[PDB]
Design a protein around this motif. Structure first.
Motif: not given
Ligand SMILES: N[C@H](CCC(=O)N[C@@H](CS)C(=O)NCC(=O)O)C(=O)O
Ligand SMILES: N[C@H](CCC(=O)N[C@@H](CS)C(=O)NCC(=O)O)C(=O)O
Lengths: 208, 208
Positions: A67, B94, B98
């Motif tokens: 990410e 992260k 996402q």
């Protein structure tokens, strides 16, 4: 520590990570995977997507990160590039969110069989791109320093200059004679960061 | 301090801000602008875009904030919801990145004259949506606590549940019988946050 950045042959999503490291003065190995080799590499990557960062210890530890902007932010946070106060933190993030909005406009032109590519470029250059470049101009104007936030490099500087490169990929003269705060920002950034200036001069032109 | 959140009649981009405040236990005034009234309101908003947050002092100061996730992060950072360590910070980000990837899949279905709307929904439910839901599942699995990161609420919890509501807007049964980590996450989140549970029960169903 050994730091390996894994991405495809381009600027894309990995660019914010590379620039962060470069600006920070952190050495890393820059691994580019070919589209032909990607099918065999994909299963060895946690989450099976790129960019991925593999950090190895001198004591055998292996840390995988995925990410891109989560990685960039973590690295930027490590090397004092996310603001020194809550207010500066807010302004870094404000400029990042604005820059990413514009990146998403750019994304709309990808995976397009030409012709409709061109029809989209026109849509966005006539619509949201100028709106976003102007908002970015105002974000820069409100800084108390030479750069995005204060006088020191932050992740916002890096994310901005990568997104502008994508705008100029669509229309190279789009910012000519306009948006003086953005030209000046790039100018101040390179002055402030000889490492980033050298890094930018050693790319390695890529289609994205 | 008086906090005013300004957006349109919906969840959309303002949702992460509202949920952050709600979870934090911070009172605010929730102002919704109608599409009819937006033309006259637009010039009174710094940057002319929503969401915007207007914070007023008991000493006359007025602070304007724009860029939803920059606001959410600043507020989350104020109320200890962005991680207690660098590692937790990374994992919050992260999961946010996402969740936003998936939000951008959802965005592709907007401003579409139906028919092509449906053709897109199929594209994404058959393509990247399942890929992203699975990646999110892995992000949740790697937590040491009941929630996204540890056992305490972070912005990642909030951003996730808003994005899932958008997925279920496209296909309400898309997660039925699947992705147990996401159902369980929502379950743990509401258990951990009575304020967020009550807030969720008092919406006010909206088309976005
Ligand atoms: N949220 C993005 C997702 C990365 C992504 O979209 N990866 C693409 C390449 S840019 C990919 O790995 N696609 C090939 C595949 O899924 O096998 C990030 O910044 O890390
Ligand atoms: N980066 C976004 C941008 C906000 C945005 O796209 N605003 C839309 C509404 S969701 C808007 O203000 N459009 C109406 C207009 O531009 O006049 C954010 O999260 O703040």
């Amino acid at each position: 520590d050994h730091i390996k950045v894994i991405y495809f042959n381009g600027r894309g999503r990995a660019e914010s990570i590379r620039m962060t490291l470069v600006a920070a003065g952190v050495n890393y190995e820059d691994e580019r995977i070919s589209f032909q080799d990607w099918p065999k590499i994909k299963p060895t990557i946690p989450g099976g997507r790129l960019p991925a960062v593999k950090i190895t210890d001198n004591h055998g530890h292996v840390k995988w990160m995925v990410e891109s902007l989560a990685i960039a932010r973590y690295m930027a946070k490590k090397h004092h590039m996310m603001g020194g106060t809550e207010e500066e933190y807010y302004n870094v993030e404000k400029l990042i969110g604005q820059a990413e909005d514009l990146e998403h406009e750019y994304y709309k032109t990808l995976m397009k069989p030409e012709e409709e590519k061109q029809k989209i470029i026109k849509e966005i250059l006539n619509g949201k791109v100028p709106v976003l470049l102007d908002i970015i101009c105002e974000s820069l104007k409100a800084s108390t320093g030479k750069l995005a936030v204060g006088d020191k490099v932050t992740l916002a500087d890096l994310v901005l200059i990568a997104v502008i490169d994508h705008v100029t990929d669509l229309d190279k003269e789009f910012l000519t004679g306009k948006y003086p705060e953005i030209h000046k920002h790039r100018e101040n950034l390179l002055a402030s960061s000889p490492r980033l200036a050298k890094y930018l001069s050693d790319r390695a032109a890529t289609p994205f």
